[PDB]
Amino acid sequence: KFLVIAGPNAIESEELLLKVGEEIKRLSEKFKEVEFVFKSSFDKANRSSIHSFRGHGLEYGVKALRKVKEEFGLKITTDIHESWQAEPVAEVADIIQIPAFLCRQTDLLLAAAKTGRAVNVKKGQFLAPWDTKNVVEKLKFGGAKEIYLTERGTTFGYNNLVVDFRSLPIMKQWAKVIYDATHSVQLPGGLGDKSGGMREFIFPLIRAAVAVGCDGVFMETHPEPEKALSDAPTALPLSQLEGIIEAILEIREVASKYYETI
Amino acid sequence: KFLVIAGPNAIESEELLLKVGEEIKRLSEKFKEVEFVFKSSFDKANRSSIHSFRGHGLEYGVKALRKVKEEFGLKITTDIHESWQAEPVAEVADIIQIPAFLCRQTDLLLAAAKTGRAVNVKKGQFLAPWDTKNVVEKLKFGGAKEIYLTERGTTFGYNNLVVDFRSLPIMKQWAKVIYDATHSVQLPGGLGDKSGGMREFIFPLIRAAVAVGCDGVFMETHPEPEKALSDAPTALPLSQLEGIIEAILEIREVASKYYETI
Amino acid sequence: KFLVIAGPNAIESEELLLKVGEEIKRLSEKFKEVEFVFKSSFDKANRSSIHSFRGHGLEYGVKALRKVKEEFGLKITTDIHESWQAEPVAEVADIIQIPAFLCRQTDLLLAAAKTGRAVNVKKGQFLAPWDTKNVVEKLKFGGAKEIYLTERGTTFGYNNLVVDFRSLPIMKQWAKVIYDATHSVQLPGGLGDKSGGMREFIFPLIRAAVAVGCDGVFMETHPEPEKALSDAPTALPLSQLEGIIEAILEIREVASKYYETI
Amino acid sequence: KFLVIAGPNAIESEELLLKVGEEIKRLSEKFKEVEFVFKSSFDKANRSSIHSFRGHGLEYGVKALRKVKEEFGLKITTDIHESWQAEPVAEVADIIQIPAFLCRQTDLLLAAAKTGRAVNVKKGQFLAPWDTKNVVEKLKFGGAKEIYLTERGTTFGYNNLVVDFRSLPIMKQWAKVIYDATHSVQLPGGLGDKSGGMREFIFPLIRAAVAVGCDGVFMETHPEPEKALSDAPTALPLSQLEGIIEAILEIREVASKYYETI
Fold this sequence. Notes:
Four copies of one chain form a homotetramer.
Chain A: E1 3-7, H1 14-30, E2 35-39, H2 57-72, E3 75-79, H3 86-89, E4 95-98, H4 106-113, E5 118-122, H5 132-141, E6 147-151, E7 154-155, E8 161-162, H6 167-171, E9 176-180, E10 186-187, E11 196-197, H7 202-212, E12 216-220, H8 238-256
Parallel strand pairs in A: 1-2, 1-12, 2-3, 3-4, 4-5, 5-6, 6-9, 9-12
Antiparallel strand pairs in A: 7-8, 10-11
Helix pairs in contact in A: 1-2, 4-5, 7-8
PDB class: transferase
Keywords: KDO8P, transferase
Assembly: tetrameric
């Protein structure tokens, strides 16, 4: 079934995770045909400014994710930044996510693929579609079986990303494909010491992703994006989450008939 | 009323135009909810090589297009390359097309608008979406009342183009928007003394366009794409047009309600 | 001898031309080992806005340029935008300049080549260095003997240009190469209905161009840059020309030894 | 005191570091006004293919490097990929190198800075010149005193990089700037399983860098580049290292009297 990865960008507090996990859970019950996964980073190890919010550490984070997984019975996914976090994080994460900038760090991929968990690699802003093939080969070598590749934009000039949708069918040749609807529209370092974004384009490109054909969508949400401690201009409101989900399912029903073979 | 602009890239002969027109006429009768416009260039004025096919002249081209209009009752569109061509072309063209490399040539835009005919400007590979606002302003200054802006890709590195679908909603603010499904996947000068392309991406990107939201699609076609005298690697088999059109209408039907208001 | 093409961007008035020509003449007398060419456009046919300054017509311009040539004995270059302008322009222009957006327009190149004059083609912002071979081929076919290709930046994301200095040795294989120091640092439609620019990068990049190896430098100048009716954010103050020319001659002198052959 | 960072791409064999360190030593004796620093990676932690050469371990590397430093009395630099490697590597490395893909990894930067050693950050292929200011701020916050920023190209379309020389004067505002002459001409994933490159542009782009103005150059060398275990198509022949160094010194001597003031 279609995959939908949602949740706040960062674990600002397990209280937030629970509030969001609540809505996701509800949606999990309304759309039984969709496989939901709660997502949230315990640490923003790559902020532009040393002064920006990062998180409360792996311990706190893993705990919060457990709470959500136990209280709502939802699958969990979070990203690791160094080889040593794979094993410990793999205790709660159903899917281990590999950060975009780190999509080529061999040891990080192997460590994630040794936990037996599923691994979702964010396609680097510097990588070409056909280049993700080796990324999958590394994971396969590392013992991974459930592998995902996530489209999240490509470097287009300075402080700007463009989504080359030709990547969806190209990467589908060797791995399940996910489209990152929130980071694809962000503007790297667009705010001096922060990365801005253009929310007005999140939904439109999501509709495009589904029409083209992907195995799932990735989208970060938050009660009040304006108050988000990370990626505020790209965080999608919780109240809009349901409507958008209904849209992708409808579009997916009509378009699936036309998706090309692998 | 969705617009479908289709036809052979160039006027290889009056015979080729009548063969493609017969099909477009069939399609116009089958899909009465779609507005069809037959397209074909009387001159490829911007070929990479001095040895490539250009055409049989304006007089011959205008005559061939009038035959199509008279015989099948179809609307006509063709592109101009120098100001003096606007008037004679207007005798038969319902829509005057302005080439991508020339989207900033003031006199050409003005001459086209002065004819009283609708004008469709191919957005230059060097132009940002917001830069098209001045393009529309020039046309209105020139007296144009019906104006279109066509997305046909942007320069991405050498010999490659990317389609930034954020441009559709942006350009929709000042004019009707068309998606050029054939040129958007072409590879500029990719074949040495000629250009290339990737036909496999044509359909999927078209699905993206209608899902995002546009007022029409531009698709070039040929009975035998392989033998086309220009843009061969991009011409769509004439028999595949029907299925494509059906798909766009189905996708547009479900996606239309999600179209964000400008 | 090294080529220095300089002058005010547009023929704002003959007073302006004469004031600039006076300094170029003085520079001509001081730097005998340099071939200076006075440049000025009789019409800005590609402005972003219908409201921007274009010029006072071809006739006024050819006369203003003839005045410069007669009063100062300087060679002349100016650009044409449509085929019919080549002949009248050739009456005074020693070098006919072909605009960047129009570098692929066969008829414009052929018309320029037909005059017997030298032809300088600005490399399109959408063109790859290797694709300029075909441009030279058209010109030669049309009878041109003295051919120049000018580097003026390539599209890099929106509203930005980057200079790929790899283009200098590549294009040198088939033509003499000129480095456009002013337009290479401009920012396409940066200030809305006008192009921006960063004058602080003009000199540094000119140094790079001569170190890599080229046959000349194209640089615009104005008595009061900020008051220029065209390309304001890029013209160099007249008083700065001397210092810059000295530097290029000195850098060239030491680097020429290392220029790669053929 | 111009800085020259040269050496083999990776620690392939002791005999390699010796044959190169020997030449680098001889050169350091010939050009006393230049500060040479021996460089070589003890591990290629981000190769495209899991089947490509990586190294012989951190131990074998730190050891082989100390051999170079003790035997030839040459400063050393190598890059780290994970936090923990900071402390151990710093016991031999005068300058800790931060990989291009990792220039945003806060903890990695903070770790190299705590060691007290000098830090050189390769600018990410996805980073804009002005984005480096936050990088320097992080390092200073971590205790770094001697900080370098290295230009190594920017993503330009797929499988290609371009060097935007405007970056040199831009990064010089907050740190010393180094120009990576070898990786800047490499073609990412250009050969599918491995990256490509165009060695013919190495020298010319080096001349540009010094003409523009930088504090040093980074050059990878090998006795027989074609036989290199990594970056074979970009490594510079060892025997050419001398001619190149002389050339940049001559160009620097003349161009330096024109460097702008930061």
